[PDB]
PDB file of C-alpha atoms in Angstrom:
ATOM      1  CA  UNK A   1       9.917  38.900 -16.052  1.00 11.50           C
ATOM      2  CA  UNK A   2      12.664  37.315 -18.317  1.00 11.21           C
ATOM      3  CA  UNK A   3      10.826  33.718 -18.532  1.00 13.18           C
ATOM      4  CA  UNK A   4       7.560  36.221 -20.116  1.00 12.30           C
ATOM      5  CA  UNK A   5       9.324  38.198 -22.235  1.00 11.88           C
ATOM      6  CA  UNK A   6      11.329  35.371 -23.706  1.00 13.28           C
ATOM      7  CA  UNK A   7       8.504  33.036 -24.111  1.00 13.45           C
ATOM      8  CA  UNK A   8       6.574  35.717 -26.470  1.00 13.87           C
ATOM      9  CA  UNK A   9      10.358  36.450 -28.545  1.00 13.56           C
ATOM     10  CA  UNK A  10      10.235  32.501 -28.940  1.00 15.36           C
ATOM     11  CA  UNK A  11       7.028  31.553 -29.623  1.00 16.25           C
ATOM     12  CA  UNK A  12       6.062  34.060 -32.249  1.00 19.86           C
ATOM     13  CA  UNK A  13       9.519  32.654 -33.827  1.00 22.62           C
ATOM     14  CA  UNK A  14       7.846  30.718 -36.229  1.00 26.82           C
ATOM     15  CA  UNK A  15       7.915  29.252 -39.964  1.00 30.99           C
ATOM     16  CA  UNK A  16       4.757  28.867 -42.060  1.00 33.90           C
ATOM     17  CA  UNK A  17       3.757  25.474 -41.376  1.00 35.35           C
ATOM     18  CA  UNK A  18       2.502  25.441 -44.975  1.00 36.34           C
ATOM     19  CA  UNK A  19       5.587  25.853 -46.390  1.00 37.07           C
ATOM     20  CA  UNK A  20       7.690  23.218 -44.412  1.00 36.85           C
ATOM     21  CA  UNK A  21       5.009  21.041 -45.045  1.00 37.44           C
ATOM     22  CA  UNK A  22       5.408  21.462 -48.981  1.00 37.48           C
ATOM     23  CA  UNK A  23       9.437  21.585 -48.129  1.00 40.15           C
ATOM     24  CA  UNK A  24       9.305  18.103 -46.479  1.00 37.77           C
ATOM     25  CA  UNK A  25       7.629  16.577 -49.529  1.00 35.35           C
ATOM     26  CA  UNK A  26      10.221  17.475 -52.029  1.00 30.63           C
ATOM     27  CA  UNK A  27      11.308  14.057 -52.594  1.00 30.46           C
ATOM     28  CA  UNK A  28       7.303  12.973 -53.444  1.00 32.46           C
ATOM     29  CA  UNK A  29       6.159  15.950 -55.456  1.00 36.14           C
ATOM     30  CA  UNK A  30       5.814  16.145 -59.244  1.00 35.98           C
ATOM     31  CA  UNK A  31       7.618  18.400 -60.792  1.00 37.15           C
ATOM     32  CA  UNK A  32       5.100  20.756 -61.324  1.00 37.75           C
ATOM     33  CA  UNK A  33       4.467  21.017 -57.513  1.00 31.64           C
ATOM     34  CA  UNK A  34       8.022  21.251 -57.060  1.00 31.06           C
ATOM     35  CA  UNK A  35       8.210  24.458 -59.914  1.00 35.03           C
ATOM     36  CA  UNK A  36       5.252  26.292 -57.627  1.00 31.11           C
ATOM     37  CA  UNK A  37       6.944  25.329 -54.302  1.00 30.00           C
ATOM     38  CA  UNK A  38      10.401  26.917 -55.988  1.00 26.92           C
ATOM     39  CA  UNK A  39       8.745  30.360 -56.487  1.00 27.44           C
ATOM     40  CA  UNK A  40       6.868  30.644 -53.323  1.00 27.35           C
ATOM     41  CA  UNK A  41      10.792  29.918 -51.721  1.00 26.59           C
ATOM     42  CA  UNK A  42      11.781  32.813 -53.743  1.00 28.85           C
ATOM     43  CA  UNK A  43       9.257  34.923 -52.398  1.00 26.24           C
ATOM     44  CA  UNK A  44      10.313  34.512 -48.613  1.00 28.39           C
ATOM     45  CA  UNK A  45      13.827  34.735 -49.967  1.00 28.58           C
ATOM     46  CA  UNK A  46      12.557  38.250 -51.231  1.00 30.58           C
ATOM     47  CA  UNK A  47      11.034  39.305 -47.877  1.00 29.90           C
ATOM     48  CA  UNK A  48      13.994  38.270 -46.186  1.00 26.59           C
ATOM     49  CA  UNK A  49      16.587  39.789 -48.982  1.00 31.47           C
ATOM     50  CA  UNK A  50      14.068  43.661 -48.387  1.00 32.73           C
ATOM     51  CA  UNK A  51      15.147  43.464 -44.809  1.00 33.83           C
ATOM     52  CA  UNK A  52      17.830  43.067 -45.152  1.00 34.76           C
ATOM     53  CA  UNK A  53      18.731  46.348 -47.800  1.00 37.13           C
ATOM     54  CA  UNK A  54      17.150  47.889 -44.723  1.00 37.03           C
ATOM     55  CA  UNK A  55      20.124  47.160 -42.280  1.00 34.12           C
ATOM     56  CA  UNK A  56      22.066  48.136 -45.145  1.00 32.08           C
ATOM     57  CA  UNK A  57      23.700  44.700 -45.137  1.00 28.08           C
ATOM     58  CA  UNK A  58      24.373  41.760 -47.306  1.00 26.54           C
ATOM     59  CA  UNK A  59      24.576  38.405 -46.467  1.00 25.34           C
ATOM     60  CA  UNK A  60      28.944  37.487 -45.529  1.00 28.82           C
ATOM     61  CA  UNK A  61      29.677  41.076 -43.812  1.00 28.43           C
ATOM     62  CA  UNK A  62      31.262  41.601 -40.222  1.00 30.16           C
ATOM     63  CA  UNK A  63      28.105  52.785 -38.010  1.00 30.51           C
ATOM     64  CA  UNK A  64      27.372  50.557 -35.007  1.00 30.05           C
ATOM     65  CA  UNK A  65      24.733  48.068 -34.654  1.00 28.47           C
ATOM     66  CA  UNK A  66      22.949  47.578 -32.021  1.00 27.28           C
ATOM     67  CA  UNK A  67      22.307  44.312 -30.003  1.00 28.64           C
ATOM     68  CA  UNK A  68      18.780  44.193 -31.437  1.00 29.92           C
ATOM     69  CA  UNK A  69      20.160  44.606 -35.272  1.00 28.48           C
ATOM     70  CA  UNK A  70      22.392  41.919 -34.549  1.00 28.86           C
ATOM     71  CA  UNK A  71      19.745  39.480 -33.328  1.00 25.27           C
ATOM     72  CA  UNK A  72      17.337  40.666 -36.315  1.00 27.07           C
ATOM     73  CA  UNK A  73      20.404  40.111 -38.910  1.00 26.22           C
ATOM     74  CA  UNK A  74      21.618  36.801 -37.594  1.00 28.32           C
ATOM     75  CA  UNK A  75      17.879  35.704 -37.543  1.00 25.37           C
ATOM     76  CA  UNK A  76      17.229  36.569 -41.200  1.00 25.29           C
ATOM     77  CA  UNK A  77      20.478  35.404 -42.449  1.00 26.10           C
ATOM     78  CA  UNK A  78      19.657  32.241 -40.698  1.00 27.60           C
ATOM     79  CA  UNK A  79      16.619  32.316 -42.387  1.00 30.67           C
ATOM     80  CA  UNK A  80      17.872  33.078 -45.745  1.00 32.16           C
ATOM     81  CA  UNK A  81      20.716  30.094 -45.809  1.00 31.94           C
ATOM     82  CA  UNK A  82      18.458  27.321 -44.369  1.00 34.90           C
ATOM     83  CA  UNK A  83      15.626  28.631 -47.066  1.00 38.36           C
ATOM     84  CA  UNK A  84      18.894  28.889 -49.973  1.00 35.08           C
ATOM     85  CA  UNK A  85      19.338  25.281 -48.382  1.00 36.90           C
ATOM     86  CA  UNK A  86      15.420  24.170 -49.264  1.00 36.14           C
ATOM     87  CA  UNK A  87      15.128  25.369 -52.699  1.00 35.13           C
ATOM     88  CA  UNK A  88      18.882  24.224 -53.451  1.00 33.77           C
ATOM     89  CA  UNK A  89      17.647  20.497 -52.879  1.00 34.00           C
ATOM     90  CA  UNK A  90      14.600  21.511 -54.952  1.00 33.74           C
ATOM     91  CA  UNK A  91      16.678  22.645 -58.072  1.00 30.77           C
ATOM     92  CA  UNK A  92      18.587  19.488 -57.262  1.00 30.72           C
ATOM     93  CA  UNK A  93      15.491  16.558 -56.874  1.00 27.91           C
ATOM     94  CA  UNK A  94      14.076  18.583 -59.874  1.00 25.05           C
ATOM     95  CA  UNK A  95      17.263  18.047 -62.082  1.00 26.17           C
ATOM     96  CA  UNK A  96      16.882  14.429 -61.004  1.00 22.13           C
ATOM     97  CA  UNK A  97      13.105  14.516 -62.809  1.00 21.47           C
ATOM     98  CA  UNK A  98      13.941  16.123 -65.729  1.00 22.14           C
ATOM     99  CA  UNK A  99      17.023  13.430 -66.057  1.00 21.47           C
ATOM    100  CA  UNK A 100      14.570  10.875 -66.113  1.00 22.68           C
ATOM    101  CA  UNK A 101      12.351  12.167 -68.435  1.00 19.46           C
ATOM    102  CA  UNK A 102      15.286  12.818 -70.809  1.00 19.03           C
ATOM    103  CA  UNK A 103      16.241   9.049 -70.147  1.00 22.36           C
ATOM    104  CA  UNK A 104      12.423   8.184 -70.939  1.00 18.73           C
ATOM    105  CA  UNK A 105      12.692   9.808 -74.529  1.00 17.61           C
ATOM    106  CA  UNK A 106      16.152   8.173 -75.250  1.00 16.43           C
ATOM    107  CA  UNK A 107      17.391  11.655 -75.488  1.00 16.91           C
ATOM    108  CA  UNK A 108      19.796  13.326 -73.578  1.00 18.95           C
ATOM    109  CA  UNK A 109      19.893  17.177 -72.685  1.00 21.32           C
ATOM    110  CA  UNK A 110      21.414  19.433 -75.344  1.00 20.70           C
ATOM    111  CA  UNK A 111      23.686  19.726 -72.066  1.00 23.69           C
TER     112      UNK A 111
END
């Protein structure tokens, strides 16, 4: 049955709660928080980044794939740019911190 089959693709299509948790609370945490967040980002971008070497493709590129590769490839490429999203605002809040601690110092970065 297609209803079966596609409820069991879907529902095991799934982030770690934990991590869009942590993700949603950019904007609150410390930078330290934010620094720990930043590499565990990195290592999901890893696991994504192995799978795809395995499909022997990169992340802008048009033997034959299959139906199935193409599902897995747009799937982890979607992953990879909405997680390249995440951590991008990271860096960015996080340059916001460290521009106010500058400011609190009087000093500016070297730059």
């Amino acid at each position: 049955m297609e209803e079966e089959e596609l409820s069991k693709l879907l529902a095991n299509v799934k982030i770690d709660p934990s991590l869009t948790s942590r993700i949603s609370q950019i904007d609150s945490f410390k930078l330290s928080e934010l620094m720990v967040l930043k590499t565990d980002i990195e290592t999901q971008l890893e696991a994504y980044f192995s799978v795809l070497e395995q499909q022997g493709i990169g992340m802008d590129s048009a033997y034959p794939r299959s139906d199935v590769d193409v599902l897995q490839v747009t799937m982890i490429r979607k992953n990879v740019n909405m997680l390249k999203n995440d951590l991008n605002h990271l860096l960015q809040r996080s340059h916001v911190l460290l521009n106010q601690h500058f400011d609190n110092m009087n000093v500016k970065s070297n730059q």
